[PDB]
Design a protein around this ligand. Structure first.
Ligand SMILES: Nc1ncnc2c1ncn2[C@@H]1O[C@H](COP(=O)(O)OP(=O)(O)NP(=O)(O)O)[C@@H](O)[C@H]1O
Length: 269
């Protein structure tokens, strides 16, 4: 079942039920049936039958252990975020999956206003809340992309739920390309990192999987772990980006760049 066919199975009542979950996510993981019903203005027994069907379609997860409650699955939060995008007129048709990992699923899509785009659906103080965390990641990526506009990153078009709509870049991940000028490519990445840093942004997950390259130049993507300069740990997070990208170039190309000196250079500007 592709996300487009799933979308086709939803009626108005289905969307209202999902809106009622979404609007109560901040105070419950599993939103009580009574509250889904009251918010949606759908009687309890009918709301219950909707949620059972949504669960059969893997859009919600229903629990009954302590009380009758429901929350989004990944697919469901994504479907609902897509809906917000369609209703807002920013997306007209979802397209094919481009790829999926542990952190996101990225789809092709078409917008009359913005052309052929990507929509990226996000997955995933006490170290040991799926939806609120995925939505927070999405918003973080959207805000970083907005702050970076004009640099070599995708243009950003919208954020709803766990979804960020952005420009399709026609370029390959660095890790799939054998560049013949690695020293110059590494310097271009490091210069872009300095530009982010001058805008008050640290990427936070820089790697060979989110530098894109073409004959035209490089682009950088993937900002859900980004932080603002002078956030807790920002400097160490920045050093890690610089060290990690330099280390990939050392392993792959035996480039000679010194990590500590590259960091001090970016930091001094
Ligand atoms: N705007 C874009 N244009 C072209 N391809 C993109 C775009 N966003 C994502 N992709 C492709 O989809 C992949 C996954 O997106 P990405 O933003 O890196 O999320 P992630 O897979 O969840 N984290 P990671 O693999 O660590 O970079 C990329 O490595 C790109 O190959």
């Amino acid at each position: 079942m592709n996300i487009a066919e799933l979308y086709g199975k939803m009626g108005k009542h289905s969307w209202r039920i999902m809106d009622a979950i979404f609007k109560n996510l901040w105070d419950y993981e599993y939103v009580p049936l009574q509250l889904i019903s009251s918010h949606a203005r759908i009687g309890e027994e009918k709301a219950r039958n909707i949620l059972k069907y949504l669960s059969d379609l893997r859009v919600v997860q229903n629990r009954q252990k302590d009380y009758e409650g429901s929350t989004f699955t990944f697919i469901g939060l994504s479907l609902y975020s897509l809906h917000r995008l369609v209703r807002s007129g920013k997306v007209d048709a979802i397209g094919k999956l481009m790829g999926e990992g542990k952190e996101s699923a990225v789809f092709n899509c078409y917008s009359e206003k913005f052309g052929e785009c990507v929509v990226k659906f996000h997955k995933v103080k006490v170290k040991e809340h799926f939806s609120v965390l995925a939505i927070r990641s999405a918003r973080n990526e959207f805000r970083a992309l907005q702050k970076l506009q004009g640099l070599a990153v995708p243009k950003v078009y919208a954020w709803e739920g766990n979804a960020v709509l952005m420009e399709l870049i026609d370029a390959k991940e660095l890790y799939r390309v054998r560049v013949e000028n690695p020293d110059e490519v590494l310097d271009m990445i490091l210069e872009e990192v300095a530009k982010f840093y001058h805008r008050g942004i640290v990427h936070g997950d820089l790697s060979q999987y989110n530098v894109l390259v073409s004959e035209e130049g490089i682009w950088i993507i993937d900002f859900p772990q980004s932080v603002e300069v002078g956030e807790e740990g920002w400097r160490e997070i920045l050093e890690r980006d610089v060290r990690n990208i330099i280390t990939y170039f050392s392993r792959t190309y035996r480039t000679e760049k010194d990590i500590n000196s590259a960091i001090d250079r970016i930091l001094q500007e």
